[PDB]
């Protein structure tokens, strides 16, 4: 009994699209600069709901007009998925971001929309309000970037106490901040934004070491990869990105060990078979 909700944020309020409507969310997240994506195929829309949603989702009013100083320029939508049995719920949060693309995939008799949301699509920000530090340490540049983007930060790396001269004075917008933080020191320590938290950590270290996820049931088989172990699983509302995993396989006994998560491929369909999440993991140090 999968329970999947797509919650928009609109001037009227939140209009939650439940799992009764045919919905299909393909989220793909990674420990990269690039904004994590979520494609949303939603069918069964009424005329009123289509008017209330698609008309608000637009790329105008910031190009041929002005109507922009803060948020409400583009609609922010979150995704809450999970399971529910015996009356209890498991609705976690799996994506927060603003819509960028909107098309239609299925014509009548089932008018189904397909939107494309991206995390931190508010690169329509205020062109960097506070100037970046002139000479400062890496953790301090990270703190400035987090404060500029408005997100709380988790910075855990061994490169924090390294000074930089002009760390990002060429930055043009807030989104480019993450690009700069990713650009400097990129063999291991890659920074990203997971939902509302900006994470800057080494690629071989776990963000929350006490939050290891012991994994014993898999769909298919936990197989090797040129980096670590890769495996698909049924939706567990406790697996984030950059988290620690404690794979204990049966089919492949050599893949057992502790791994950190680098990528994540959510594929959630209320009215269809795919309700999986795919994990790319690398050896954890």
């Amino acid at each position: 009994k999968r329970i999947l909700r797509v919650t928009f944020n609109m001037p009227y309020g939140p209009e939650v699209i439940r799992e009764d409507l045919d919905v299909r969310v393909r989220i793909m997240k990674a420990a990269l600069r690039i904004q994590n994506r979520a494609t949303m195929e939603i069918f069964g829309l009424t005329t009123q709901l289509r008017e209330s949603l698609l008309s608000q989702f637009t790329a105008w009013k910031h190009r041929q007009r002005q109507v922009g100083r803060e948020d409400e320029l583009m609609i922010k939508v979150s995704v809450e998925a999970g399971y529910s049995d015996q009356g209890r719920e498991q609705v976690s949060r799996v994506f927060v971001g603003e819509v960028a693309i909107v098309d239609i995939i299925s014509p009548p008799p089932d008018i189904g929309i397909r939107i494309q949301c991206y995390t931190r699509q508010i690169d329509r920000t205020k062109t960097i309000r506070n100037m970046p530090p002139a000479n400062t340490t890496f953790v301090k540049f990270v703190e400035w970037g987090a404060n500029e983007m408005g997100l709380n930060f988790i910075c855990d790396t061994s490169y924090n106490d390294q000074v930089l001269k002009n760390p990002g004075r060429s930055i043009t917008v807030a989104s480019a901040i993450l690009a700069s933080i990713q650009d400097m020191y990129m063999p291991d320590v890659a920074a990203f934004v997971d939902d509302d938290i900006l994470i800057v950590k080494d690629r071989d270290k776990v963000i929350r070491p006490d939050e290891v996820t012991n994994v014993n049931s898999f769909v298919g088989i936990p197989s090797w990869s040129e980096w670590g172990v890769e495996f698909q699983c049924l939706f567990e509302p406790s697996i984030r990105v950059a988290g620690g995993v404690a794979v204990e396989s049966l089919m492949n006994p050599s893949v057992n060990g502790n791994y950190v998560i680098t990528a994540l491929e959510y594929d959630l369909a209320s009215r269809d078979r795919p309700f999986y999440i795919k994990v790319m993991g690398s050896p954890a140090a």
Binding site: N130, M131, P133, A134, N135, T137, K140, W144
Partner: protein, 52 residues
Amino acid sequence: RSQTRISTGSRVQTPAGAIFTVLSDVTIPAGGVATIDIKSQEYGNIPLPVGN
């Protein structure tokens, strides 16, 4: 002249101070401003009264 002092500007006292500047401070052309400070560690400290 016309300098913006840096947030968490690190300064060391002669007993290994390691103090950060709190406020985002921008100086003045006159040649003197005031900064707030915080010690790197939660420990008890007593800085020397002279600039180090």
